[PDB]
Amino acid sequence: AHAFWSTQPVPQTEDETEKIVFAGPMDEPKTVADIPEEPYPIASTFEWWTPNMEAADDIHAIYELLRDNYVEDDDSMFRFNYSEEFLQWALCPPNYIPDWHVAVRRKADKKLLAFIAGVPVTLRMGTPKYMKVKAQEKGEGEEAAKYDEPRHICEINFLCVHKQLREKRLAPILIKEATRRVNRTNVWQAVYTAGVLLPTPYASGQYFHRSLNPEKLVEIRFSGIPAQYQKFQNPMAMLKRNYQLPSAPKNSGLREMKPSDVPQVRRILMNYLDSFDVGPVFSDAEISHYLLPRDGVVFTYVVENDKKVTDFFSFYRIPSTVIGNSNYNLLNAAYVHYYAATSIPLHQLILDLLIVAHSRGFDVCNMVEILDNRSFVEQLKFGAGDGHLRYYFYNWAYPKIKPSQVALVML
């Protein structure tokens, strides 16, 4: 039933997943020298291309492929429209490996047909707390602890095949070539997320959304006026009042993050992320890159009191193309990124995120139920969406975990 995934080192079923007791590799141990030197064979009318992500033209080519051919909703109404500036940010973090960005071009005209991207991440991915307890009960602690140390692996994103080339088995070719390029650098695990169900997630979470501009969301059919709003004389006025927010932040000590904040933000974030079973480890350079504000891309605020940063939050922008609406062309969404609260309840910190996003022209705030995101859903009027995000590893056995044990945000 899976002609490609049946051949790969991933858990093949839930049954098998349910029996996994320790973190560790699935495949035969290999070395760089075992891996083919030459790119995987491809049809003579195509060619491999490694884009230069500091070439504006190269970024633009990737941008147009994704604009026209990347993830849609299930009803042909919206398609993500990651910006060029976003793509440069996401695909070029500190110590990125240019060779991990893999494209296929039509040899004739250099038309971009397919793309997949890999970036480095340092991930805690050892045996989860609940399974370490089971291991102690069996006298198997050392086994359970073997892969505790953070590992330098690959994060995969932006897999895309042009609509005219779908269902021709090009995606497997891309995945095999990205795998080869990663393994040639002595890395043997990857982490990736997808909405679709593949063999086999180690975690899954629902999406949640919080309306910031209900008038617009209703006009574009992101939202409807919910049935209960009918018994009302005037549905929309009531809807706007429900989702109204303050014009200005409520925490007095809130301001935008600046470079001098990097060490303190690193400390409070890393202390917080320690409480989750799977999560990233960031250097100062990686905190700088992923969290310092960038116009139109990522937005980060700290709470500072007595000259100390005590809390922070970040969000990033992914707009979508609205297909066929005579009033609007774009949906402007804000996505909850990393945060840490030490001084105030998390709901009070994230209310200021909603206030800031609204004041900056965002239409909706999205998130997945990872981290402690469930703790502020009801008070802050988030609603569950139809969608789910599934978390996967390549070449890593891992026990099933709850999404509230996951701390990796994927863009």
Of the candidates 152, 227, 211, 200, which has an alpha carbon nearest to the alpha carbon of residue 334? Answer: 211
Residue 170 annotated as lining a ligand binding site = yes
- Pick the closer one to ligand HXQ by CB: 188 or 208: 208
Residue 170 in contact with Mg ion, rule: CB under 5 A: yes
The least CB distance from residue 159 to ligand MYA, in Å, is: 3
Provide the strand spans (E) within 268-329: 279-280, 298-305, 308-322
- Pick the closer one to ligand MYA by CB: 166 or 255: 166
Residue 43 in contact with Mg ion, rule: CB under 5 A: no
- Pick the closer one to ligand HXQ by CB: 181 or 209: 209
Binding partner of residue 154 among ligand HXQ, Mg ion, ligand MYA, none, CB cut-off 5 to 8 Å per kind: ligand MYA
Which residues make beta-bridge pairs with 192? 156, 392
Residue 123 annotated as lining a ligand binding site = no
Residue of 19, 168, 255, 258 interacting with Mg ion (CB under 5 A): 168
Binding site for ligand HXQ (CB under 6 A): 71, 73, 78, 80, 157, 193, 195, 207, 209, 222, 318, 366, 385-387, 389, 410
Of the candidates 124, 194, 198, 96, which has an alpha carbon nearest to the alpha carbon of residue 405? Answer: 124
Residue 342 annotated as lining a ligand binding site = no
Binding partner of residue 386 among Mg ion, ligand HXQ, ligand MYA, none, CB cut-off 5 to 8 Å per kind: ligand HXQ
- Pick the closer one to Mg ion by CB: 173 or 365: 173
Binding site for ligand MYA (CB under 6 A): 2-5, 69-71, 154, 156-161, 166-172, 175, 178-179, 182-183, 187-190, 192, 194, 196, 198, 394-395
Which residues make beta-bridge pairs with 305? 308
∠198-369-197 over CA atoms, to 5°?
10
Whose tokens are 């075992």? That residue is: 34
Whose tokens are 């997320």? That residue is: 193
Whose tokens are 């997945």? That residue is: 368
Number of H helices, E strands in the chain: 11, 14
The least CB distance from residue 378 to ligand MYA, in Å, is: 30
66, 239, 346, 411: which is the annotated catalytic residue?
A: 411
- Pick the closer one to ligand MYA by CB: 46 or 229: 46
Residue 349 annotated as lining a ligand binding site = no
Residue 362 annotated as lining a ligand binding site = no
Active site (annotated) includes residue 113? no
CB 187 within 8 A of CB 27: no
Q: Which two tokens stand for residue 370?
A: 């990872």
Alpha-carbon distance of 254 to 251, in angstroms, equals 6
Strands 151-161 and 190-194: parallel
Q: Which two tokens stand for residue 339?
A: 């945060």
Catalytic residues: 411
Q: Which residues are annotated as a binding site for tetradecanoyl-CoA?
A: 2-5, 159, 161, 166-167, 169-171
